[PDB]
Design a protein around this ligand. Structure first.
Ligand SMILES: O=c1ccn([C@@H]2O[C@H](COP(=O)(O)OP(=O)(O)O)[C@@H](O)[C@H]2O)c(=O)[nH]1
Length: 449
């Protein structure tokens, strides 16, 4: 027998990624053990969409308690805009090493091979794989390969052996992440480099095959195989209040506005966003929700809308403060654009569904993700100016981006290329598609005898 152990990093997008990778691996009838804390399994199951987990067949969940930690609320005034309030959870999560080490030994006793798919950020938890002869590790790289490869390419001194004009215009990484997270990323990545058999990327070669091909060259990944197995989100969705609202609108007329789970705005920036959406005169859905804590069931979530605002926008705008069915919204005919922080899973969501992006990158991989969507693939527009990222984004800038995407002739041109990208992304997962071929080969790799 072959068995797979999923070990996500305990944060929303990372937990959800490996649930949907499990959805993709499940038709191959390979047993899967999905491992997190009780709180994060609760979170992952509660927010899961477009996968009936209760009918997933060879799928086993393990909930391992970890020591208590500070579930600090987000700090909107963090100059980096990075969710630095998660650092106590980064620390606490390393104590999954003990139960995961026990589980890997237990599974390796009876399986021909134990295949450990883990977030690079949690590599230390699974490092016992290098001590088990019939266990091997595939590290999941969670952001765009463009971002991941461009960073490796810069660390190697920018070799000209790969040609790509976009690499000459990369946005600055400066201040994108706090120094603590630098150290953690380097430490965990170096660990994964020591014992990983391969890396898995949540991307499709239809989106970024050129950069997947560069990264797989021995110059850049030497002997560690790279697999492009995405998008992990479904490529079609089978009534929510947001969807009832969309049902009332004209085709491609609604701007969807949402910033994932790692973004915390100042009250001032929220006010400019409110006024900008009103000044756009477009219909919109605005997901206004504080960033996640390291335990989303701890504490009380923080914002006041401007006086008389929610009355003046009643026909035009829907404002929601909870968890929404993002992919289903993006799949609705009435959705005309997506204002996004350009977290990679939201980029994939939008690309899959053919919805053009109004990009507002904030931290980490988001600026390079955004330059891939807007500048390389040509299916979006920028809300903010990255070289001015410390400045308040004015309501005028926001309204200009929204009207461009939803209302103007140039927006219809961006939308047409977005629609063509969507068709190619959805085809890559069907039979004969490039992602299906990658997944078939990955499955062949991990079940070799
Ligand atoms: O109300 C919401 C907000 C987000 N998402 C999902 O949450 C993830 C957001 O991941 P992303 O990489 O965009 O950002 P992060 O939250 O890590 O900043 C994606 O799976 C979205 O589909 C969702 O289902 N509902």
């Amino acid at each position: 027998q072959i068995v797979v152990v999923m070990v996500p990093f305990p944060a929303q997008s990372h937990l959800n990624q490996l649930l949907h990778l499990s959805r993709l691996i499940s038709p191959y009838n390979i047993p899967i053990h999905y491992v997190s804390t009780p709180s994060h399994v609760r979170q992952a199951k509660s927010r899961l969409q477009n996968w009936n987990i209760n009918s997933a067949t060879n799928f086993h969940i393990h909930e391992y308690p970890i020591p208590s930690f500070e579930a600090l609320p987000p700090n909107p005034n963090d100059p980096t805009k990075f969710p630095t309030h998660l650092l106590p959870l980064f620390h606490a999560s390393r104590h999954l090493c003990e139960p995961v080490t026990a589980l890997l030994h237990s599974l390796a006793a009876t399986a021909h091979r134990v295949v450990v798919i883990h977030d690079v950020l949690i590599s230390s938890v699974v490092q016992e794989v290098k001590n088990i002869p019939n266990a091997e590790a595939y590290a999941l790289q969670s952001v765009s390969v463009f971002n991941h490869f461009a960073t490796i390419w810069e660390m190697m001194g920018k070799p000209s052996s790969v040609e790509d004009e976009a690499l000459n215009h990369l946005p600055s990484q400066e201040g994108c992440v706090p120094m603590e997270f630098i150290e953690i990323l380097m430490s965990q990545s170096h660990l994964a480099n020591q014992f990983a058999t391969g890396f898995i990327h949540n991307t499709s070669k239809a989106i970024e095959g050129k950069y997947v091909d560069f990264l797989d060259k021995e110059e850049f990944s030497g002997n560690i195989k790279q697999w492009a197995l995405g998008p992990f989100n479904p490529v079609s969705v089978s009534r929510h209040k947001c969807l009832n609202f969309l049902d009332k609108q004209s085709p491609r007329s609604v701007m969807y506005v949402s910033f994932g789970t790692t973004i915390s705005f100042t009250d001032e920036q929220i006010h400019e966003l409110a006024l900008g959406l009103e000044k756009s005169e477009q219909h919109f859905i605005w997901v206004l929700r504080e960033a996640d804590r390291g335990d989303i069931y701890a504490g009380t979530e923080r914002t006041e809308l401007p006086n008389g605002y929610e009355d003046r926008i009643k026909e035009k705008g829907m404002m929601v403060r909870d968890w929404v069915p993002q992919l289903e919204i993006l799949a609705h005919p009435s959705t005309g654009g997506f204002m996004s922080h350009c977290g990679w899973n939201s980029c994939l969501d939008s690309l899959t569904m053919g919805v053009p992006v109004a990009a507002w990158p904030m931290h980490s991989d988001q600026p390079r993700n955004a330059m891939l969507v807007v500048d390389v693939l040509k299916i979006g527009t920028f809300v903010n100016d990255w070289e001015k990222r410390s400045e308040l984004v004015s309501s005028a800038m926001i309204a200009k981006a929204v009207k461009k995407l939803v209302a103007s002739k140039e927006g219809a041109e961006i939308r047409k290329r977005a629609v063509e990208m969507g068709a190619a992304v959805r085809q890559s997962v069907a039979d004969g598609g490039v992602t299906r071929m990658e997944l078939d080969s990955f499955i062949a790799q991990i079940s070799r005898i």
